[PDB]
RNA sequence: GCCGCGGUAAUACGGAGGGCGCGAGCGUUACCCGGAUUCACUGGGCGUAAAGGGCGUGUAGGCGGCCUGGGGCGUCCCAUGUGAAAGACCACGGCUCAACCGUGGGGGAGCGUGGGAUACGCUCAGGCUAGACGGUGGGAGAGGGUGGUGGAAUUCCCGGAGUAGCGG
RNA sequence: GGAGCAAACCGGAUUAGAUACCCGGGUAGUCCACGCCCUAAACGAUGCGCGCUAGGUCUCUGGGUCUCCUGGGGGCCGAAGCUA
């Protein structure tokens with residue numbers, strides 16, 4: 336039962352800030368806002384989910400990327416609630432395109448993971464229980480969810496592909512398909528599997544991000560609750 | 570005033586296709602229609618049809634592309650890679666049948682107006698005629 | 708030849724050894740075409756590289772929207788005359804080969820005559836209204852010409868007051 | 876015709892010199908009419924006309940059912956594309 340749960344508070348988005356290549360997915364400009372076509376979202380939904388279903392059961396990987404602030408957290412919920420990687424704070428240049436190298440930083444993280452619970456939580460020169468331990472802070476900050484995948488993913492799920500354009504670029508460059516929740520903001524043509532929605536509303540990001548992680552576990556059996564996905568929602 | 574309606578038509582097509590338009594209208598002419606027929610038969614366009622735009626005769630023209638493509642820039646391959654007038658008001662070009670050219674070793678057409686009607690190179694060569702060399706499409 | 712070598716370690720000068728290339732020849736100079744899509748038909752350019760005329764008006768010229776009919780000048784087709792020989796292309800032959808040559812075949816732009824086609828171009832006649840022009844009503848404007856007129860300022864002249872400098 | 880400005884020119888400075896830059900004078904000229912001249916970084920350094928190809932934003936000027944839509948003109952950012 337998706338359907339009218341979309342009208343729920345999740346249809347339409349921005350206004351006169353549009354990309355005109357997103358014109359097909361628009362129903363009208365009621366009240367000076369671009370109300371995005373409800374039902375075309377559904378036609379795009381199944382096709383997308385179907386690709387995820389297939390990708391999920393094949394034991395592949397999605398990379399979740401939401402760095403815009405309203406998504407920051409609801410992304411790291413659903414990604415963890417799917418055992419998938421996520422990128423949350425900053426998309427770094429070449430997480431994908433220069434993966435090998437950015438990986439070496441994961442490699443470094445767990446050398447320092449290995450010195451907190453260690454005999455050297457007592458020793459190390461004075462100016463190194465900040466020098467080393469502050470290095471682990473940043474590595475913790477950016478490479479929280481990215482620490483998981485250790486070969487390129489098989490797809491990426493992007494929240495705002497215009498906000499997250501550097502990421503999409505790299506995907507396509509590498510022929511990694513691009514799933515995205517996108518809206519009037521964005522150029523659809525370079526999203527492979529698009530979910531015409533609303534990159535802003537915590538409702539919309541939530542409704543979609545979660546139900547997609549249903550399918551992900553549900554292609555593996557044994558679904559859980561509609562998730563810890565309500566920050567202090569309001 | 571529009572000096573060459575055929576060049577116009579061709580160019581409307583060239584232009585609409587370069588931004589993956591679904592269709593273009595082009596002011597209607599019988600001659601224009603005959604060129605489209607060929608164009609359609611040879612699978613460059615989907616097809617075409619008469620219409621009125623502000624109650625005046627056009628020819629809507631349904632364009633046609635490849636599939637979506639892979640990496641960066643997934644814009645479709647084009648069916649009309651090339652389309653180009655030859656004979657023009659400034660300089661008409663006429664050929665005998667022995668000097669009708671082979672367009673891109675035949676992977677391409679040349680439309681061609683003859684006294685046995687508008688024809689492609691092959692149609693006209695087998696029909697043993699020449700005439701005004703209108704345009705080449707690949 | 709062009710780029711450039713030579714000022715004490717010159718594969719660039721001169722000689723040696725060695726090597727490369729052609730060979731009864733090999734180099735030089737001169738001249739033509741090439742490369743040179745560097746006069747661009749095929750096949751180029753002009754915002755800053757060379758290159759948009761200072762701007763208009765408009766002659767000759769070039770180019771010309773949509774529909775129907777007539778003519779068939781361009782255009783296309785068929786047939787035919789002509790395109791000598793040599794040379795050029797291909798066979799087969801003659802000098803031992805070849806060069807040279809004999810025979811036969813095949814092309815060949817262009818032009819003449821007769822027949823045909825009528826899509827596009829031209830032409831003649833007819834139609835249309837999408838170009839163009841016009842009519843009605845409404846507008847903004849340091850567009851232009853003539854006459855008039857206003858205030859501020861500078862200079863000069865006259866008057867008052869004022870005195871030792873001003874100006875730069 | 877001539878107020879002011881001002882090539883030339885007459886002076887004062889500055890300078891090694893100063894045929895200049897600075898200061899003080901100053902004629903043509905700058906002004907008007909008529910007649911010539913016909914040039915320019917006469918520049919958008921971009922010939923004219925026509926059709927076609929995303930948008931966004933600011934501005935001048937018309938019309939509409941005046942939130943918004945639709946002409947004409949002047950700018951800015953920019954699709955496709957073009958460009959050394």
Ligand SMILES: NC[C@@H]1O[C@H](O[C@H]2[C@@H](O)[C@H](O[C@@H]3[C@@H](O)[C@H](N)C[C@H](N)[C@H]3O[C@H]3O[C@H](CO)[C@@H](O)[C@H](O)[C@H]3N)O[C@@H]2CO)[C@H](N)[C@@H](O)[C@@H]1O
Nearest residue numbers: 653654657659747750751752753754758759921922957958
């Ligand atoms: N050079 C720029 C301008 O060219 C203008 O006119 C020219 C341009 O408008 C246009 O030329 C186009 C050019 O715009 C565009 N960059 C693409 C095209 N290659 C050119 O085209 C030209 O050259 C090609 C060969 O290259 C020819 O095959 C073609 O027939 C010819 N029109 O068509 C005209 C042909 O020369 C004006 N003369 C003037 O504004 C200025 O000279």
Ligand SMILES: NC[C@@H]1O[C@H](O[C@H]2[C@@H](O)[C@H](O[C@@H]3[C@@H](O)[C@H](N)C[C@H](N)[C@H]3O[C@H]3O[C@H](CO)[C@@H](O)[C@H](O)[C@H]3N)O[C@@H]2CO)[C@H](N)[C@@H](O)[C@@H]1O
Nearest residue numbers: 793794795796797798799800801805806807808809810811
């Ligand atoms: N017509 C009969 C004979 O034909 C000959 O014409 C022929 C020959 O001269 C020549 O033919 C021969 C060719 O058949 C044979 N298989 C090879 C030989 N290379 C050619 O020879 C020619 O070409 C080369 C280089 O082009 C030159 O030596 C020279 O041009 C000529 N000898 O080209 C023509 C066709 O083969 C003579 N030119 C002519 O004097 C003689 O009558």
Ligand SMILES: [Mg+2]
Nearest residue numbers: 425426427428
């Ligand atoms: Mg960063």
Ligand SMILES: [Mg+2]
Nearest residue numbers: 581584585593
């Ligand atoms: Mg078009």
Ligand SMILES: [Mg+2]
Nearest residue numbers: 665667784817
């Ligand atoms: Mg003939």
Ligand SMILES: [Mg+2]
Nearest residue numbers: 713715716717
């Ligand atoms: Mg020596």
Ligand SMILES: [Mg+2]
Nearest residue numbers: 712718719720
């Ligand atoms: Mg030498």
Ligand SMILES: [Mg+2]
Nearest residue numbers: 719720721722
């Ligand atoms: Mg030597």
Ligand SMILES: [Mg+2]
Nearest residue numbers: 743744745747
């Ligand atoms: Mg040449």
Ligand SMILES: [Mg+2]
Nearest residue numbers: 747748750751
């Ligand atoms: Mg040319």
Ligand SMILES: [Mg+2]
Nearest residue numbers: 745747751752
């Ligand atoms: Mg050139």
Ligand SMILES: [Mg+2]
Nearest residue numbers: 756757758920
């Ligand atoms: Mg120049």
Ligand SMILES: [Mg+2]
Nearest residue numbers: 759760761922
């Ligand atoms: Mg000009």
Ligand SMILES: [Mg+2]
Nearest residue numbers: 763764765923
């Ligand atoms: Mg004119």
Ligand SMILES: [Mg+2]
Nearest residue numbers: 766767768769
């Ligand atoms: Mg004329």
Ligand SMILES: [Mg+2]
Nearest residue numbers: 572771772828
């Ligand atoms: Mg005509």
